[PDB]
Amino acid sequence: NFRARQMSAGAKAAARFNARRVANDWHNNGCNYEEKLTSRFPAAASSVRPTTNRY
Amino acid sequence: MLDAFSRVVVNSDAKAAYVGGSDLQALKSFIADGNKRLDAVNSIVSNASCMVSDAVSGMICENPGLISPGGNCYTNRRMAACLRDGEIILRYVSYALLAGDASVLEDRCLNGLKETYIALGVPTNSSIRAVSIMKAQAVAFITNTATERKMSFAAGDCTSLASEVASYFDRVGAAIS
Amino acid sequence: MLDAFSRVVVNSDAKAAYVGGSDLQALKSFIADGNKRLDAVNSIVSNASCMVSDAVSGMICENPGLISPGGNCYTNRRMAACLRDGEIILRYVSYALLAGDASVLEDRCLNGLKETYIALGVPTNSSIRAVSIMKAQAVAFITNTATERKMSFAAGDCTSLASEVASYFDRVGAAIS
Amino acid sequence: MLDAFSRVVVNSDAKAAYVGGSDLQALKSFIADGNKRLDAVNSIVSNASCMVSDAVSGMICENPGLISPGGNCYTNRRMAACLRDGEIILRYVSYALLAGDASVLEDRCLNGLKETYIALGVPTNSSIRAVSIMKAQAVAFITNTATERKMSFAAGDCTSLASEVASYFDRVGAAIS
Amino acid sequence: MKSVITTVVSAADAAGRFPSNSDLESIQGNIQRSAARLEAAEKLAGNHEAVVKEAGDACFAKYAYLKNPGEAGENQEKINKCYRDVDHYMRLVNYCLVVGGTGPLDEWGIAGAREVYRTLNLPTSAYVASIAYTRDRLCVPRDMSAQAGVEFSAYLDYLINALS
Amino acid sequence: MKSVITTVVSAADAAGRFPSNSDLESIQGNIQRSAARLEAAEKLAGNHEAVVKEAGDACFAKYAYLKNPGEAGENQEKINKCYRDVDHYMRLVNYCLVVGGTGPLDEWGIAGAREVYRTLNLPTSAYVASIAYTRDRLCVPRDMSAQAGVEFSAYLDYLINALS
Amino acid sequence: MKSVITTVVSAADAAGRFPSNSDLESIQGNIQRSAARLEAAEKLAGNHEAVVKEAGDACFAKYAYLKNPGEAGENQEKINKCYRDVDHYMRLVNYCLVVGGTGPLDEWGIAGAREVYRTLNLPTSAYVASIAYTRDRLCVPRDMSAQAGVEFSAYLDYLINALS
Amino acid sequence: MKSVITTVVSAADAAGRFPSNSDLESIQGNIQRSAARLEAAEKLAGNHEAVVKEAGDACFAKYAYLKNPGEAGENQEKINKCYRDVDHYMRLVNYCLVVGGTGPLDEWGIAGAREVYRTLNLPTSAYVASIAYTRDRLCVPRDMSAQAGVEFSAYLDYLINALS
Amino acid sequence: LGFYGRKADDFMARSIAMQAKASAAGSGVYTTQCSEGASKGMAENARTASLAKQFR
Numbered sequence A: 001n002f003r004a005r006q007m008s009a010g011a012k013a014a015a016r017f018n019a020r021r022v023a024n025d026w027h028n029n030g031c032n033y034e035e036k037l038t039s040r041f042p043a044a045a046s047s048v049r050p051t052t053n054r055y
Numbered sequence B, C, D: 001m002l003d004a005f006s007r008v009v010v011n012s013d014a015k016a017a018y019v020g021g022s023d024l025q026a027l028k029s030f031i032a033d034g035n036k037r038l039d040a041v042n043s044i045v046s047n048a049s050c051m052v053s054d055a056v057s058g059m060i061c062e063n064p065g066l067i068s069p070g071g072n073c074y075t076n077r078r079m080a081a082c083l084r085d086g087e088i089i090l091r092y093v094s095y096a097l098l099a100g101d102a103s104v105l106e107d108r109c110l111n112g113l114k115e116t117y118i119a120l121g122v123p124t125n126s127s128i129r130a131v132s133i134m135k136a137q138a139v140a141f142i143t144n145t146a147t148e149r150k151m152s153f154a155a156g157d158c159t160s161l162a163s164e165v166a167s168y169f170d171r172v173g174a175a176i177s
Numbered sequence E, F, G, H: 001m002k003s004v005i006t007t008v009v010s011a012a013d014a015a016g017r018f019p020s021n022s023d024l025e026s027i028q029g030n031i032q033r034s035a036a037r038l039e040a041a042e043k044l045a046g047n048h049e050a051v052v053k054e055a056g057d058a059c060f061a062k063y064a065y066l067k068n069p070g071e072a073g074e075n076q077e078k079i080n081k082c083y084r085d086v087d088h089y090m091r092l093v094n095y096c097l098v099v100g101g102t103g104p105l106d107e108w109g110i111a112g113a114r115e116v117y118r119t120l121n122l123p124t125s126a127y128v129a130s131i132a133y134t135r136d137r138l139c140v141p142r143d144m145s146a147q148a149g150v151e152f153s154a155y156l157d158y159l160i161n162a163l164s
Numbered sequence I: 001l002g003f004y005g006r007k008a009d010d011f012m013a014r015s016i017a018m019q020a021k022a023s024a025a026g027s028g029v030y031t032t033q034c035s036e037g038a039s040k041g042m043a044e045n046a047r048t049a050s051l052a053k054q055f056r
């Protein structure tokens, strides 16, 4: 958890654009509310983990 | 995401308005100008490999201080990420020319776009020059007013689409500022 | 990321310059010093659990404020979390001497290290005290001024490494402050 | 993974054999032929773009049945996987030439690899032809019997690595057979 | 939202890809039958007060049990809210004749309809059957054009289908 | 970056693990052949203006088509930028003799080279063949030591390999 | 396993990459000090019955409490297994002078040592201190060469370090 | 010989019939088998110097009574006589992997040999330890290819059915 | 879907993971987002976490 905020400044800046690249396009299609929840909160839309691996 | 047919219903639902023919005639003229919009958006994506080059080579023939090392923008992966960022915004605005609405832009890239650039060390004054050259060639490409490349068309007015692309690119430039 | 080999190529990168025959005679000390550097680094990594058990005991020697209940460091998992944090300065200051440069130290722990400790309630005065124990025992191990531990060596100076390791624990002491 | 320094210990660990100087002198020839062993592996990594363009062109020279459409290896993405599979087998034998041991070939490539190819539909006979060109040019690259390309070397016999690399490529070939 | 713009400009972004001619083709089918789609919209805009009243007590004929106390229709204050409820369904189906797909239906008036109604003790069986009254309530060469009812009627049985 | 420091102090962090003697062993091979690696660096620092000019028109002998208008070498202003372009490749290969691996090559001058050049209508076939001119352009007991050319020549054919 | 072969041929596979000269350099340091490393191996092969007995009751002098019933050393049958236990540590440290790193130690005799001993009520404090008896038990210009003890002694205090 | 092809030749001579494709069947069945069979048939000529001082004395490790008077090791030239019958019995195993059948042995090796060895009084129950070391030292995916040492076993213990 | 298909299936997905371990280490770093341990070594203890996940 520390090594998220430790490692860089641009790859973690690329994370918040990458977090919409899994949620908007193949997790919440059709729901605009769940689409701007990603673009207003990418780190909240990044542990949504809809790959049901039972974890 | 949201388009010109869907722009006119998100305000009418906010007043619980049944959409009748008081505002439908703007959309009959929009669906009149469907193939005009099509004959616009074909010519943009046809030569768009040439457009991202003509931007970022014209961006640097006014400023060689980027390629001066110790600057931000000199090396090739940095130029790959420059030509990553150059094409993707051109890719996004071509969805809005197709949409007739800029709501496909504002969420997928415009949220926090400038604040990541100062977090990366990106000079945004070179970005607003680069999006202008993309704005400069595209209005000559939706018309037949290029240098050598002339697609075939049916004639008539396309400046109303040119006012849309003029109102698209600065809205990106208002967001990367 | 970058050894003391390569401090002198990233500033020549910024001038479009190359490493000509005037800057690397300190580097020709630095490659002729390959086995004196090697004869210091066995002497630190042989007694690595001495030095983490000499620092935290000498920290609880000078300060019985943390051992009080309700303090920072008194209980079981908590003191176990100290020996996490007690070695990790010694873990990367090895590589600061192995590479010859503290650039391998500057991004890998020193980014965000101070603000997490106030977010975890760690008092930084006991942190800067315990690293000064770790400096004082490491300069007596690279040299021949320990108490009982007498490793075999070849004679000569290594005060050039004693000034390199003194410019390292101050750099982590400025970044946890 | 496992190599010639570790091959002599796993038969000795299986017998609890305390290793003394009865089998050290076979490793002492491996000690003395350190620089001869690295002399062959730098002539094989310096033309590895030549060999991947020499073999499957020489494999399509001998058999034009694959470039016929409806055959195995004919179209554009299909030829990209031909250079993909063909280069990676050169990466693994260059690992195996260095260890004095094809153990690192045997686990990362040589598990189950044969009937994945016929669960795809790769003809196994064409892969014996491509590996035999890669066997025949590589034994001409570790010596000075190439057509145009002569690097500078120190003379003498080096057949003892040519028997080593010929005992590696058939181990690839018997695995895919 | 939900339209052909939500298909092809989103899938080209989901592929990280240009608007190629697969995407340019998909909107041509809007153009040749928007005239088929948009004389149906002013019918239920012209009948936005006409067919709300004829659907409520056609539903309340076959659901006449509601008027007891302790249920969903115990007073006229429920029925004053009930003609609001069918009209709020009826607003969105008018808008789906404009956007092409069922855009304003799913993200506003369909998703999570099966977490609300019988929790508020509102019968869902009367909700589809008030709509299924209006589903067959059409006459294709007489009310509208013949090219207008097949967008209308396919959205109304969808409302029973989306509650399933 | 890319060195043996990028291997073992990162893999011990990727294992969440101490710098054990697997990590302490890997940097010993730097020490015994940094003297082999770092008399090659001042050769191309001593020839940083000598072999840029001999590689450009050796490339432009076998690529002499560029001088027409409408191509990559239509004026001397392109050729004034072209000796900048081979030297900017030549800067990084000098730095990879210092860091050990190909550290300054991949994150600065290699990754995404196949998204730039023919988009700017620059021929990539002339780019590897200008480098492949300089790849065989060596003489190992005469220019440098015999322990210096095998780091140099293995990086230059890598530049053709990394563009593949 | 754990050696410099486990570093560089695995990292080149972890990069998906050739054995470049970063990998070829790392094994040169084996060659110049294998003669330093492998006269230490036949010392504890020559003393494989000599120093097992001198370490057991040097440990059992400072751990003399074990001989009561209900503990780890209640009979000679424990002590017959106890000289097996120090020798099984002593087998692996001999092998790590051959493979270079601590190859046979970690995957066989180190990992999960802190899930076994006090669960079998075996004291771990006597285990490191029997080894720490043998750690200082050396004399570098007299028993072996001066280039042989620094591989030996760095592995024995590692055994206290790896149990930490 | 009894080979892969030679079965259907005399079967064609039996009925007066011809080679059909079932007569042509197993010739594919050897060439689909022998992609790695000739590796160990080469490695019987490729490891035949270490194994003559492995399998020649693997009899002598168990049968230590061969230096009795009245045996094969009372004189030094008869110690050569059992060693050539490991040297020929790994050159004929080199000759048996390639035929397909037991082709060298049913003309020369097994040809009368149950009568032979007990009148020269050589123990044929001591010939099994020349073959039993070639049955347990076989670790297949490190010495040969993985299919090839399975079939190499099958020629090898068929000789054990001849001697025992 | 076959014994031959089952032993095929884990080999290419190992190669898919080793493809994708080579995009993590595109540039030759074991990058810091992948962590599989603690401060104390315990990745042999997290082997038994992952081999439990191999087993469960």
Ligand SMILES: *C(=C)C1=C(C)[C@@H](Cc2[nH]c(/C=C3N=C(/C=C4\NC(=O)[C@H](C)[C@H]4CC)C(C)=C\3CCC(=O)O)c(CCC(=O)O)c2C)NC1=O
Binding pocket: C047, C049, C050, C051, C054, C055, C057, C058, C059, C061, C062, C132, C133, C134, C136, C137, C138, C140, C141, C145, C146, C147, C148, C149
């Ligand atoms: C309690 C009040 C108290 C202690 C506990 C102890 C801790 C301490 N130690 C030093 C200085 C050193 N410690 C060293 C480490 C070791 N010395 C050894 O002999 C063994 C080999 C090893 C431990 C495994 C070394 C080398 C030093 C340097 C001087 C020296 O040789 O002794 C300090 C002082 C720290 C400082 O001055 O910054 C302390 C507090 N001492 C206590 O007083």
Ligand SMILES: *C(=C)C1=C(C)[C@@H](Cc2[nH]c(/C=C3N=C(/C=C4\NC(=O)[C@H](C)[C@H]4CC)C(C)=C\3CCC(=O)O)c(CCC(=O)O)c2C)NC1=O
Binding pocket: D047, D049, D050, D051, D054, D055, D057, D058, D059, D060, D061, D062, D132, D133, D136, D137, D138, D140, D141, D145, D146, D147, D148, D149
């Ligand atoms: C098709 C008709 C056809 C080919 C294509 C071509 C391929 C081929 N090449 C060989 C043998 C070799 N190839 C070698 C590689 C190179 N030679 C060079 O000069 C450069 C340096 C390098 C390519 C970058 C080498 C060294 C050999 C060995 C012999 C030699 O020196 O030429 C074969 C034969 C393979 C075999 O014998 O199994 C083939 C098919 N030849 C064609 O006929």
Ligand SMILES: *CCC1=C(C)C(=O)N[C@H]1Cc1[nH]c(/C=C2\N=C(C[C@H]3NC(=O)C(CC)=C3C)C(C)=C2CCC(=O)O)c(CCC(=O)O)c1C
Binding pocket: F010, F011, F012, F014, F015, F017, F018, F020, F022, G010, G011, G014, I021, I024, I025, I030, I031, I033, I034, I035, I036, I041, I043, I044, I046, I047, I048, I050, I051
């Ligand atoms: C995301 C980075 C990554 C790559 C590439 C990879 O292969 N694995 C990850 C992280 C990582 N973890 C290690 C090191 C070790 N891991 C273990 C436990 C192994 N044993 C097991 O049973 C399993 C489950 C299959 C694993 C992973 C051990 C014992 C080590 C040894 C290192 C040490 O402290 O001695 C590594 C480094 C080495 C490697 O190449 O795997 C990385 C990069």
Ligand SMILES: *[C@@H](C)[C@H]1/C(=C/C2=NC(=C\c3[nH]c(C[C@H]4NC(=O)C(C=C)=C4C)c(C)c3CCC(=O)O)/C(CCC(=O)O)=C2C)NC(=O)[C@@H]1C
Binding pocket: A023, A027, A028, A029, A030, A031, A032, A033, A034, A037, A038, A044, A045, A048, A050, E106, E107, E111, E112
């Ligand atoms: C939008 C109206 C969609 C739609 C949404 C539904 N989602 C349901 C559960 C669900 N949705 C998400 C993604 C989204 N919800 C969030 O809260 C956030 C982040 C803040 C996001 C991105 C998640 C992760 C979940 C599971 C738990 C949760 O609600 O958070 C849901 C209930 C049924 C179900 O479990 O799927 C609905 C109705 N569904 C639609 O029909 C439109 C298109």
Ligand SMILES: *[C@H](C)[C@H]1/C(=C/C2=NC(=C\c3[nH]c(C[C@H]4NC(=O)C(C=C)=C4C)c(C)c3CCC(=O)O)/C(CCC(=O)O)=C2C)NC(=O)[C@@H]1C
Binding pocket: D034, D035, D036, D038, D039, D040, D042, D142, D143, D144, D153, D154, D155, D156, D157, D158, D159, D161, F146, F150, G021, G024, G025
């Ligand atoms: C057959 C495979 C070869 C060949 C082998 C011989 N090489 C001899 C000497 C030699 N080769 C090199 C370069 C090599 N060593 C390295 O460390 C590296 C890079 C990591 C490379 C490329 C050197 C430096 C030497 C001299 C050192 C030495 O081996 O003693 C050699 C003669 C041995 C000697 O000179 O004592 C032989 C037989 N040479 C050939 O001609 C073919 C191509």
Ligand SMILES: *[C@H](C)[C@H]1/C(=C/C2=NC(=C\c3[nH]c(C[C@H]4NC(=O)C(C=C)=C4C)c(C)c3CCC(=O)O)/C(CCC(=O)O)=C2C)NC(=O)[C@@H]1C
Binding pocket: E056, E059, E066, E072, E073, E078, E079, E081, E082, E083, E084, E085, E086, E088, E089, E108, E109, E116, E120, E122, E123, E126, E127, E130
């Ligand atoms: C009368 C013909 C109906 C009936 C209607 C009732 N609906 C009640 C509440 C209610 N209805 C909806 C769905 C509808 N209203 C909307 O605002 C929208 C979307 C714009 C839709 C599709 C909702 C979401 C709610 C709850 C919030 C609200 O009151 O609007 C209602 C009142 C129940 C109460 O307060 O106890 C009635 C009477 N009920 C029936 O049984 C017949 C079939």
Ligand SMILES: *[C@H](C)[C@H]1/C(=C/C2=NC(=C\c3[nH]c(C[C@H]4NC(=O)C(C=C)=C4C)c(C)c3CCC(=O)O)/C(CCC(=O)O)=C2C)NC(=O)[C@@H]1C
Binding pocket: B057, B060, B067, B074, B075, B076, B079, F056, F059, F066, F072, F073, F078, F079, F081, F082, F083, F084, F085, F086, F088, F089, F108, F109, F116, F120, F122, F123, F126, F127, F130
């Ligand atoms: C001349 C011998 C060449 C040739 C060179 C040209 N390169 C041009 C632009 C260019 N080149 C690179 C790669 C190089 N430049 C760098 O700054 C770095 C890294 C530090 C590298 C590896 C890049 C990234 C660019 C674009 C940005 C820039 O201008 O620096 C170029 C100008 C093209 C134009 O403006 O139209 C030329 C002429 N071109 C050739 O065909 C021959 C082989």
Ligand SMILES: *[C@H](C)[C@H]1/C(=C/C2=NC(=C\c3[nH]c(C[C@H]4NC(=O)C(C=C)=C4C)c(C)c3CCC(=O)O)/C(CCC(=O)O)=C2C)NC(=O)[C@@H]1C
Binding pocket: G056, G059, G066, G072, G073, G078, G079, G081, G082, G083, G084, G085, G086, G088, G089, G108, G109, G116, G120, G122, G123, G126, G127, G130
């Ligand atoms: C005597 C000087 C010691 C002591 C020794 C005992 N160890 C016992 C069991 C045991 N020991 C180990 C570690 C060691 N044995 C190995 O086989 C290997 C690796 C090859 C190592 C490092 C293990 C793993 C075990 C359990 C399995 C086994 O018995 O080998 C033991 C018996 C305990 C019992 O049966 O109750 C004894 C007496 N114990 C001491 O306290 C002193 C210090």
Ligand SMILES: *[C@H](C)[C@H]1/C(=C\C2=NC(=C/c3[nH]c(C[C@H]4NC(=O)C(C=C)=C4C)c(C)c3CCC(=O)O)/C(CCC(=O)O)=C2C)NC(=O)[C@@H]1C
Binding pocket: E043, E044, E046, E047, E050, E051, E137, E138, E139, E140, E142, E143
């Ligand atoms: C087609 C259904 C049958 C025929 C004649 C009928 N015409 C009827 C007309 C009618 N429809 C409505 C409701 C109407 N208005 C709307 O906005 C919508 C939906 C969008 C609908 C269905 C009303 C108020 C009338 C009466 C006034 C008028 O004629 O417009 C009808 C229903 C009964 C009635 O009220 O008259 C029938 C029956 N002729 C045929 O051949 C068809 C069988």
Ligand SMILES: *[C@H](C)[C@H]1/C(=C\C2=NC(=C/c3[nH]c(C[C@H]4NC(=O)C(C=C)=C4C)c(C)c3CCC(=O)O)/C(CCC(=O)O)=C2C)NC(=O)[C@@H]1C
Binding pocket: F043, F044, F046, F047, F050, F051, F137, F138, F139, F140, F142, F143
């Ligand atoms: C080895 C190639 C052959 C022999 C003689 C030659 N020497 C040549 C020397 C030469 N090389 C350069 C470029 C040089 N400078 C650099 O910095 C680098 C790369 C890092 C290189 C390759 C120059 C400018 C010269 C001339 C001045 C000098 O001698 O230093 C050469 C090339 C042709 C030439 O210009 O002279 C040859 C040929 N002798 C042999 O036995 C080898 C076959």
Ligand SMILES: *[C@H](C)[C@H]1/C(=C\C2=NC(=C/c3[nH]c(C[C@H]4NC(=O)C(C=C)=C4C)c(C)c3CCC(=O)O)/C(CCC(=O)O)=C2C)NC(=O)[C@@H]1C
Binding pocket: G043, G044, G046, G047, G050, G051, G137, G138, G139, G140, G142, G143
């Ligand atoms: C160096 C320690 C001091 C000096 C003299 C001593 N020599 C001793 C020798 C000794 N050592 C052992 C155990 C030995 N054998 C091994 O295999 C290993 C480890 C790999 C070790 C440590 C034995 C059995 C002896 C006695 C027989 C002999 O001399 O070889 C020693 C220990 C006490 C003793 O038993 O004699 C001392 C003390 N001289 C100096 O100047 C050093 C201070």
Ligand SMILES: C=CC1=C(C)[C@@H](Cc2[nH]c(/C=C3N=C(/C=C4\NC(=O)[C@H](C)[C@H]4CC)C(C)=C\3CCC(=O)O)c(CCC(=O)O)c2C)NC1=O
Binding pocket: B020, B021, B022, B023, B024
């Ligand atoms: C006695 C008064 C009386 C009327 C005014 C109409 C009632 C009427 N029809 C329309 C609605 C309409 N009226 C027309 C007709 C036209 N629209 C034009 O601008 C042209 C001048 C004309 C063509 C002949 C059309 C095409 C619509 C639908 C489009 C729209 O106004 O939104 C509107 C405005 C929007 C609405 O409420 O629907 C009104 C009040 N019927 C009546 O009984």
Ligand SMILES: C=CC1=C(C)[C@@H](Cc2[nH]c(/C=C3N=C(/C=C4\NC(=O)[C@H](C)[C@H]4CC)C(C)=C\3CCC(=O)O)c(CCC(=O)O)c2C)NC1=O
Binding pocket: D007, D008, D009, D010, D011, D012, D014, H040, H043, H044, H046, H047, H050, H051, H136, H137, H138, H139, H142, H143, H144
């Ligand atoms: C034609 C077939 C063929 C064989 C059957 C072997 C036979 C063989 N094995 C070894 C020698 C060896 N072979 C092994 C390997 C192993 N020891 C084990 O415990 C495992 C069962 C096995 C695979 C892991 C080892 C470790 C040695 C050296 C030490 C020893 O003898 O145990 C040697 C000595 C020389 C050498 O190293 O090659 C020979 C001739 N080689 C061959 O060419």
Ligand SMILES: C=CC1=C(C)[C@@H](Cc2[nH]c(/C=C3N=C(/C=C4\NC(=O)[C@H](C)[C@H]4CC)C(C)=C\3CCC(=O)O)c(CCC(=O)O)c2C)NC1=O
Binding pocket: H059, H071, H072, H078, H081, H082, H083, H084, H085, H088, H089, H108, H109, H120, H121, H122, H123, H124, H126, H127
């Ligand atoms: C080319 C075909 C060929 C074979 C099939 C084998 C088998 C074989 N071995 C021997 C021959 C022999 N074999 C042995 C061997 C032994 N006696 C014992 O009591 C022990 C069991 C064993 C010890 C190793 C001895 C001692 C002789 C010679 C008989 C004698 O001179 O006493 C002979 C007799 C002819 C000869 O001298 O070669 C043959 C055919 N060797 C071959 O050359």
